[PDB]
């Protein structure tokens, strides 16, 4: 799994 | 202090509640994000059928907003509308503007595959959509905690703790070394990053409890992973090498004042559902820009971490147990 914002 | 479930060293969530009827949710407490969202009872997405949902009509403290809003992450997008209610975390409570998620179809390899309900952002105001003040910042202003700071202790597999307001000295050994943020947006510091012989100087290092791995740019990692006889299984973010590999370096992280290091045990583990002689590298290429690394869970599983809004910095120390 997980890669968390933009 | 909020207890965190650990799932394969890749994901950590704990309990929170929204509303008068103490509606429970599991939240990824996420230092790489700055919005709270929860799946609504109006969420029709398949991901939502296995989640704890939010019913505004059950809570007498619910306040309507309804402005439409979207959050994008590296793992996908959620979509909903704003609402206001009292959020509880341990024995702390505040009113808060959050997202009733309505469409979670864009998060949807991960969301149905995982057991979390929502994300609770622990970043800074400027990272948030809608310019919301962080929970910990607000909590301090309301004098519900001693200091606008919080702490992450993640273990290695069989619980972790988000702790709001103070530093518990039992979580670590030796000196706590702080690092000023280069911007108050992510919890982001300057570092000279070494992956073995490949170095990027004053890189943008993002301390993120919501990222399962260490992250570098693709360009920089092609170099490193090439000469490390790894293999990507076609088309999933799984890089595999042999578990007995002598060559795997202790990664280095230098600041103007401090050295941090991450041994191979902290960034790899066996494929215990496939072949246990093969090992999975918790290093993924993620391109934010030319020089951003995410110091995710691998880092935090070694290093106890303090995020301090009053100091505008991150404190690191070697975790205990």
Cα B168 from chain centre = 20
Q: Contact B22/B88 with Cβ under 8 angstroms?
A: yes
Helix or strand or coil: residue B171? Answer: helix
Which member of B6, B30, B117, B269 is catalytic?
A: B30
**Helix, strand or coil, per DSSP, at residue B118:** strand
Q: How far is CA B308 from CA B35, B166, B174, B243, in A?
A: 18, 10, 19, 37
d(CA B119, CA B235): 26
Q: What is the resolution of this structure in A?
A: 3.0
Question: DSSP secondary structure string, B44-71?
Answer: -SGGGGGS--B-GGG-TT-EEEEEEEEE
Per-residue CA distances from B128 to A6, B73, B106, B155 (Å): 10, 12, 19, 28
B1-169 and B170-321 agree in CATH topology: yes
Residue of B276, B257, B253, B107 lying closest to B192 (CA atoms): B253
Q: DSSP H helical segments within B69-200, as ranges?
A: 110-113, 135-141
Closest to B319 in 3D by CA, of B307, B303, B306, B300: B303
Residues of chain B in contact with residue A5, where contact means CB-CB under 8 angstroms, are: 32-35, 71-73, 121, 123, 127
Distance from CA of A6 to the nearest CA of B (A): 5
CA nearest neighbour of B296 among B311, B279, B284: B284
The two tokens of residue B245 are: 């590999």
Residue B244 annotated among the catalytic residues of the structure: no
Question: Which residues does chain B have within 8 Å of residue A3's beta carbon, measured at their own beta carbons?
Answer: 73-75, 210-213, 215, 284, 286, 294
Q: CA dist B99 to B43, B103, B119, B233, B284, Å?
A: 12, 11, 10, 36, 29
Structural contact between residues B272 and B304, judged by C-beta atoms closer than 8 angstroms: no
For residue B107, give the nearest of B34, B18, B28, B12 by alpha carbon.
Answer: B28
Q: Which of B71, B209, B286 sits opposite A5 (nearest CB)?
A: B71
Q: What is the token pair recorded at B305?
A: 């971490």
Question: Contact at 8 Å (CB) between B189 and B180?
Answer: yes
Contact of B174 with B113, CB cutoff 8 Å: no
The long-range contacts involving B218-224, CB below 8 angstroms and separated by at least 24 positions, are: B218/B285, B218/B287, B220/B195, B221/B195, B221/B283, B221/B285, B222/B285, B223/B198, B224/B195, B224/B196, B224/B198, B224/B283
CATH for B1-169 is: 2.40.70.10
Domain locations in chain B as residue ranges: 1-169, 170-321
B103 in active site: no
CB under 8 Å to B102, separation ≥6 — which residues? Answer: B40, B42, B43, B44, B79, B80, B81
Q: Which of B71, B127, B211 sits opposite A2 (nearest CB)?
A: B211
For B52, list phi and psi in degrees, rounded to 5: -70, 125
CB B298 within 8 A of CB B262: yes
- Integer distance in angstroms from the first to the last C-alpha of chain B? 17
Length of chain B: 321
CA distance B240 to B248: 12
Tell if the CB–CB gap between A2 and B215 is shorter than 8 Å: no
Q: Is residue B218 within a helix (H) or strand (E), and if so which, with residue range?
A: helix B218-226
HSE-up (13 A, CA, CB side) for residue B100: 24
User: Bridge partners of B278?
Assistant: B242
Backbone φ and ψ of B243, nearest 5°: -75, -40
CA distance B128 to B126: 5
Experimental method: X-ray
Architecture of domain B170-321: Beta Barrel (2.40)
């Amino acid at each position: 799994x997980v890669v968390x914002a933009x | 202090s909020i207890e965190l479930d650990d799932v394969a060293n890749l994901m950590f969530y704990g309990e929170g509640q929204i509303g008068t009827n103490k509606q429970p949710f599991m939240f990824i407490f996420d230092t790489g994000s700055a919005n709270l969202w929860v799946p609504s009872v109006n969420c029709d997405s398949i991901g939502c059928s296995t989640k704890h949902l939010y019913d505004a009509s059950a809570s007498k403290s619910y306040e309507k907003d309804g402005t439409k809003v979207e959050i994008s992450y590296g793992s996908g997008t959620v979509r909903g509308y704003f609402s206001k209610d009292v959020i509880s975390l341990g024995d702390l409570s505040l009113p808060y503007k959050f997202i009733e998620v309505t469409d979670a179809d864009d998060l949807e390899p991960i969301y149905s595959g995982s057991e979390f309900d929502g994300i609770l952002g622990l970043g800074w105001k400027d990272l948030s959509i809608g310019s919301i003040d962080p929970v910990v910042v607000e909590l301090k202003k309301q004098n519900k905690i001693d200091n606008a700071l919080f702490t992450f202790y993640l273990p290695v597999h069989d619980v972790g703790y988000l702790t709001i307001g103070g530093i518990e000295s039992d979580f670590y050994e030796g000196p706590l070394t702080y690092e000023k943020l280069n911007h108050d947006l992510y919890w982001q510091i300057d570092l000279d990053i070494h992956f073995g012989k490949y170095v990027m100087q004053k890189a943008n290092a993002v301390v993120d409890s919501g990222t399962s791995t260490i992250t570098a740019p693709t360009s920089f990692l092609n170099k490193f992973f090439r000469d490390m006889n790894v293999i990507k299984v076609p088309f999933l973010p799984l890089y595999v090498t042999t578990c007995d590999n002598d060559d795997l370096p202790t990664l280095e992280f230098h600041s103007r004042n401090n050295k941090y290091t991450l041994e191979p045990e902290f960034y790899m583990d066996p494929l215990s559902d496939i072949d246990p002689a093969l090992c999975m590298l918790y290093i993924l290429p993620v391109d934010i820009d030319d020089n951003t690394f995410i110091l995710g869970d691998p880092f935090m599983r070694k290093y106890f971490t303090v995020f301090d809004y009053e100091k505008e910095s991150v404190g690191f120390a070697v975790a205990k147990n």
